[PDB]
Amino acid sequence: MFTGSIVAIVTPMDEKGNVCRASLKKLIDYHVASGTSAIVSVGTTGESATLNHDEHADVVMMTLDLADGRIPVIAGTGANATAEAISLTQRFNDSGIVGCLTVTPYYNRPSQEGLYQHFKAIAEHTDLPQILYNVPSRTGCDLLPETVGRLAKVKNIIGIKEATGNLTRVNQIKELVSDDFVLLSGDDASALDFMQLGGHGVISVTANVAARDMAQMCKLAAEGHFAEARVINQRLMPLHNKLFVEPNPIPVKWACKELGLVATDTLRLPMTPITDSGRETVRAALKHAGLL
Amino acid sequence: MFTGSIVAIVTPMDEKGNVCRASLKKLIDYHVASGTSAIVSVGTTGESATLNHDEHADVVMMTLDLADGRIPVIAGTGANATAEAISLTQRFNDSGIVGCLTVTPYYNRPSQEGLYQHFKAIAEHTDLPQILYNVPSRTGCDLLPETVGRLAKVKNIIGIKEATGNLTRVNQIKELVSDDFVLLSGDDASALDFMQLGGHGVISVTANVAARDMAQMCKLAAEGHFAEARVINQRLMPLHNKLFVEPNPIPVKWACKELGLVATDTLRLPMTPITDSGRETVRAALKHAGLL
Amino acid sequence: MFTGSIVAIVTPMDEKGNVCRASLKKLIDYHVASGTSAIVSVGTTGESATLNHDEHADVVMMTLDLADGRIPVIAGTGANATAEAISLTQRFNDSGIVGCLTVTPYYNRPSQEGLYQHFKAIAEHTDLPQILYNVPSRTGCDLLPETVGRLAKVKNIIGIKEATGNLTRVNQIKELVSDDFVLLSGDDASALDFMQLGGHGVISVTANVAARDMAQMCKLAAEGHFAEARVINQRLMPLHNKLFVEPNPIPVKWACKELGLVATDTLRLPMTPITDSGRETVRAALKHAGLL
Amino acid sequence: MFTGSIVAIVTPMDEKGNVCRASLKKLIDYHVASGTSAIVSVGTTGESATLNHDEHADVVMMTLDLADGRIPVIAGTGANATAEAISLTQRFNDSGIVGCLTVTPYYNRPSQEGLYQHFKAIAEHTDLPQILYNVPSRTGCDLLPETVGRLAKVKNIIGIKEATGNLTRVNQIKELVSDDFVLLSGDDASALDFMQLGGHGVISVTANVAARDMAQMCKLAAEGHFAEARVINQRLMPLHNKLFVEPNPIPVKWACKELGLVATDTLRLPMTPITDSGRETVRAALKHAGLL
Ligand SMILES: [K+]
Ligand SMILES: [K+]
Ligand SMILES: [K+]
Ligand SMILES: [K+]
Ligand SMILES: [K+]
Ligand SMILES: [K+]
Ligand SMILES: [K+]
Ligand SMILES: [K+]
User: Fold this and answer.
1) Which cysteines are disulphide-bonded (chains A, B, C, D)?
2) Domain edges within chain A
3) Is CATH 3.10.25.10 correct for A1-292?
4) Chain C residue nearest residue D43, CA to CA
5) Helix (H), strand (E), coil (C) string for chain C
6) Chain-centre distance of CA B172, in angstroms?
7) Does residue D184 come out as left (phi exceeding 0), alpha (psi in the -120 to 50 range) or beta?
8) CB contact under 8 A, A168 and C193
9) At what angle do helices C226-242 and C211-223 cross, to 10 degrees?
10) Contact D113 C140 (CB under 8 A)
């Protein structure tokens, strides 16, 4: 549920840029069959930025219905205004989602005290479990371990998706929080190293197209079989990197289409179709992973 | 109009975080009397992040109403979804604003080609002049000179608010664009240098509280009297730095309240109240500028 | 010998700035008694920068004599001119040192190919085992994993001191080198995390004053008792950080003096005596480690 | 003398890496004929890193001998040990050099107070004018404006070669120092901007191969004809960038050899031969400058 290989699932779109229900169902059945632990619905990879809140709720509610009780669904609920974060979260109260993935406010660059106040007010207007999400290179803002320590004392703040790719953060945070506070990597290329240091799983872009390898990799890691998990990581490492050859989720949507998992690789502006040179790059990395 | 000291005006709020019309009137009267070139309404310093589009449009319309033809108004219209950017611009068509200040998509980190498609599409669906706005430390994305040069060929893309504080950008942009494209600094601490290199003015936080000195400094810079403009800038320099001692607009709203220009220094979460130590750093910057 | 807690030993000096033999002997006996695995003599911490090559050789030869066969001694042999690196290394041929610690050329910023050529020529004019040393924040140059992979094929290039504090490098490098190529951390604050990922030890500043704790910490780590190694790391973490409160080795020399381990804390310009505020900082961190 | 286009001259070498006197003569004749203000002998571009102090002193004495009173010579005299810095300066006392170019200690990362003590001590033991040299990306250390302002009060510390390319530094230094302190750019690509902001000239790599254009560009900048200087700079700009496509002085030595100004493009390890792709990037920059 909050550990192992968690997919940050693309929002597959028809050519008009609206959610494609048939492609979404294909994707969800693929995750149930592959062993994926949970689905993060309309996170970064799911283009939260270009969906209005109604669209975004529709996709979450559609994903939960299609999951049909077979796989837990976590909703992306980030907003950079605290009143908007609370209001988006309330759409999902008493819904069936098992928890929220909520990013540090982006753009407005709050202090650590404003981060603390933002997440505490969100946690207060819900019963859902909250996973903090730190991704400074997107938000302009870095949620520090000390602040995570304060927030971990709030009853329903239960974990963090740490996407800095800064491995020292796993044990800085673990030292400050209780033993059942979940630590998840948001950086595919370092996620196995992150679990080896004591993280509990990964919210993954790579799991979109390599769900079975990823689930297998996190099970081995959780059991302590790191040399064995690493054989899989090496096969996947070209994808861990090349799925960011162009801005995520441009490469992974193309990879989904190439694999027959979705009908189209359409995205919303300002995301642009994959270039010819990106196609070639992602094709080669899919081949190396044994997927094509 | 698009030149000189342009203020990125605060959105003054009452204690419930609602726009305070009386305070906004006082600020606008102050700018008209002090020689400010234009007002940027609901930019970054105006808390665009925490106003929904409807409140956003009310603040701009209220500003135009209060301004009463006495001073031009530019609306911030940035959004990280192209469709939203376009649709927000439409609310301002025929409003009386003289142009729009439109930021690079934040958070989703599009490519240069996606930035190009983003601003081209926005520019296509309006007659209003467009000013591109680059501030990578907020958005996670850096609009490069080459892309500015391509976008400058669009009839109604008329300039750029360059907030990197990277001064090599002035002449890299300038050699790629026509002589009438306006180059505006978005970084108060380096804005006089930017103008000395060829920039045409500043969209400024300092000007909220030092309107007259800013206006004189930018007129002296425009006429080439850099040594004379530098004397005023040295006296405003603690303000240029200390209005950012805590996240902008926290220090500048406190400063406006301390001068009596606005009734309260209230902000919206995730912006938090100024700390005592911040109060003292800002008061000392205000005194060094001769404002208290 | 090339694993466990390896001390980067200070060069204790009398008040004239020359090596103090009695303080050096005190330090070496302290390491033999504490369980320290090996001594790096005239590395960074030993002020290689301010010793001329004769002075530097004298200190190495003096350290080896005092060690008297009880503890292996590794010589710092870095130089940014390849002919100087070869000539310094030759001073130690047939000497009793067990190997060299050789830093990437500093200042002149060579390419990866120049790094390759520099270390390969050094390795070729010696029989001593070579440990590569990467510390970009001092040298301006970053020896990448791919280049380490090439150099690991040279017979007597046997290991790397990785001082970036970038943990992803442990497994990037391990993937490329054979299983007996040694990986040592050059960053105290992350060295336990570095061993947990599969590193074999640490060349340590902290071991100068906490040699027993450090030796114990690396033995637990090597045996897989990470939760137990981490109890020690937490007690030492204020020292891991505060020993860089001022430029290394200014704080550790002061700490050596405060502990009675050396007679004076004299350094050579451009290193300057510890400030009063640094003293207080290092004193508190020594107290937290249970040492004072 | 301390103003205008100053060349950081290459040390031309034969195939065995020894100074090539005939080539050095040709370069010096070229600078005297082309209007270059002064020659920096054995700076960074002169491979100070790989000449021992004795070879270093020979190259400077040979340069003064060849110059024969026709053009002033400044010696690089940097060292990361204060005692060595002092002792190298003594070799140049009464030599005929007009001053010294002395870099911030590299590698050992002293504090601002240690930089202050370092340069003050060097300045104390000579009558020669001293030019401070800041280049953090080589040295790991950044000499800050405040420390420059303190050092400028020393009688014979007369200027700074500022190589950060951070243009805000020009007026931060200038307001802290007397009007006669010289500000020199050490970054060719931003040197015209630096001069437009108030700097007095450039210690330049480009000037090795574009001496006349550089000299005219710096005289036009000194007289305030920035638009005229900008036309020449636009034509030298590919050279400003591409003389750094591989580590400087690799591209500029190849360029001198391609022009026939020196007999060979040999460097000392760890500098390596130019790659074929580098050859082609540099040839194209040379052609764009009109030099081939
Ligand atoms: K609650
Ligand atoms: K909790
Ligand atoms: K239009
Ligand atoms: K235009
Ligand atoms: K050998
Ligand atoms: K080897
Ligand atoms: K003197
Ligand atoms: K002076």
Assistant:
1) none
2) 1-292
3) no
4) C108
5) CCCEEEEECCCCECCCCCECHHHHHHHHHHHHHHCCCEEEECCCCCCHHHCCHHHHHHHHHHHHHHHCCCCCEEEECCCCCHHHHHHHHHCCCCCCCCEEEEECCCCCCCCHHHHHHHHHHHHHCCCCCEEEEECHHHHCCCCCHHHHHHHCCCCCEEEEEECCCCCHHHHHHHCCCCCCCEEEECCHHHHHHHHHCCCCEEEECHHHCCHHHHHHHHHHHHHCCHHHHHHHHHHHHHHHHHCCCCCCCHHHHHHHHHCCCCCCCCCCCCCCCCCHHHHHHHHHHHHHCCCC
6) 22
7) beta
8) yes
9) 140
10) no
Which experiment gave this structure? X-ray
In terms of Cα–Cα distance, which of A292, A209, A177, A243 is closest to A12?
A209
Distance CA A254, CA A243 (A): 10
CA separation (Å) from B72 to B23, C190, C196, D245?
Answer: 19, 55, 62, 47
| CB within 8 Å of A125: residues ≥ 6 apart | A86, A89, A90
| Residue among B230, B162, B171 at smallest CA distance from B198 | B171
Return the structure tokens found at D143: 């000499």
Q: Which two tokens stand for residue B165?
A: 């504080």
In the chain, the amino acid numbered A91 is: R
Cα A130 from Cα A152, distance rounded (Å): 10
Nearest of A269, A53, A246, A57 to residue B81 by alpha carbon: A269
Q: Judge contact between D46 and D11, C-beta under 8 A.
A: yes
Place of tokens 């998990």: A229
The structure tokens listed for D119 are 């340069």
Whether residue C109 contacts residue D247, with contact meaning beta carbons closer than 8 Å, is answered with: yes
How many beta-carbon pairs below 8 A join chains B and D?
Answer: 33
Q: How far is the CA of A60 from the centre of ligand 1 (A)?
A: 21
Q: Give the experimental resolution in Å.
A: 2.3
The token duo for A43 is 């996170």
| Residue tagged 């005092």 (tokens) | C66
D99-103/B157-162 β-pairing: unpaired
3-state secondary structure of D289: coil
CB of B54 less than 8 A from some CB of A: no
How many residues appear in chain A?
292
Contact assessment for residue B204 and residue B7, using Cβ atoms and an 8 Å cutoff: yes
- List chains touching D (3+ CB pairs under 8 A): B, C
Residue numbers of D between 178 and 217 with CB closer than 8 Å to C:
none
Chain C residues in contact with A168 by the CB 8 A cut-off are 165, 167, 189-190, 193
Return the beta strands (E) in chain B as ranges: 4-8, 38-41, 73-76, 99-103, 130-134, 157-162, 182-185, 201-204
Residue C159 tokens, joined: 């290991």
